[PDB]
Amino acid sequence: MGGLLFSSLQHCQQGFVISNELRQQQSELTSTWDLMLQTRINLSRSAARMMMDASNQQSSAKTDLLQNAKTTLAQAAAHYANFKNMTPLPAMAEASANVDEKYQRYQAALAELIQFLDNGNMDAYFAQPTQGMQNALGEALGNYARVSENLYRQTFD
Amino acid sequence: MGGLLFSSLQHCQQGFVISNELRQQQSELTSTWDLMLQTRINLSRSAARMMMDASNQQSSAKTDLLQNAKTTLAQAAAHYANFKNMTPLPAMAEASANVDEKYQRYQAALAELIQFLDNGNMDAYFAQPTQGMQNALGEALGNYARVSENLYRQTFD
Ligand SMILES: c1cnc2c(c1)ccc1cccnc12
Ligand SMILES: N[C@@H](CC(=O)O)C(=O)O
Secondary structure (H helix, E strand, O other): OOOOOOOOHHHHHHHHHHHHHHHHHHHHHHHHHHHHHHHHHHHHHHHHHHOOOOOOOOOOOOOOHHHHHHHHHHHHHHHHHHHHHOOOOHHHHHHHHHHHHHHHHHHHHHHHHHHHHHOOOHHHHHHOOHHHHHHHHHHHHHHHHHHHHHHHHOOOO | OOOOOOOOHHHHHHHHHHHHHHHHHHHHHHHHHHHHHHHHHHHHHHHHHHOOOOOOOOOOOHHHHHHHHHHHHHHHHHHHHHHHOOOOOHHHHHHHHHHHHHHHHHHHHHHHHHHHHHOOOHHHHHHOOHHHHHHHHHHHHHHHHHHHHHHHHOOOO
16 A cells, blocks of 8 residues: 555546546536637627728628637537537436536527627617526536536545 | 556556646636636627617616626636646646736736726727737637646556
8 A cells, every 4th residue: 555545546547537537528618618708709899890880881890700700609519519429427417418408598699699790680689688698508517517526526535 | 357547556646646736727727718708798798888879779788797897807817816826837837837928918908998998988999909819818728728638648548
């Protein structure tokens, strides 16, 4: 014996196998979130430029930042697909189902804001309560993280 | 049964010591980038609102938004302090170094724009090259994730 947080190599390797998977699935959800907030930033960046005051030229001035929001949303959907494809560990089943619901709602909302700016509808872009769908997903993400944490801690025992 | 990824309980334990610290480092770094990105979305949602009410809409949430970016920015810096307070691992020292530089620089970009927006000066806001610096830190963070992953893989088979 010369081991300390684990009762045997079997136990130790067990915890590794369980944690390395939690680590993969939490990684895809960090990237999803990152590129979804990147999409909301590019959308704001497009709209401010849309809004710069030439006269009757109106709110639609050379914005290649909307294609940029279309790209970061597609990449977040790519990271999300990997997670979605990864079946929940039993203990995780419900934390993930919650993150999928809050995610389908916030991706819809961002895709909805791209079509608004795409058709020049500024008021609809400004009026969407995007912040609540984001806060909801942020809160289902910290909960999924509490629940991985708990399972991670149960390995060194 | 199975097949082992570790030649002994000490080899396995040694990987856990490394991995668990890497895990913590990375948690605070992701939490810094998150909050910096919500500061950016708060600032940009305020700057688009500062340009309204001029034959266009609502405007009034732009200082709630500006007060909320001061908070996410203070939360971002407290997270980075946790990360700075941690033991830099030899394999991570260079990556860590590159992250500090780019961090320091974007935190300070963000803080100037809060100031410009407090003064109501839109022109100062758009004259600042924020996105450059944000992409710079996204890059350094990607590299750090890349070098972090390398060290973690060598912890097993
Ligand atoms: C490498 C990486 N993670 C670990 C180990 C080795 C060993 C055990 C273990 C237990 C719980 C969580 N992670 C690990
Ligand atoms: N509703 C959009 C745009 C805005 O309010 O500025 C958002 O929250 O991103």
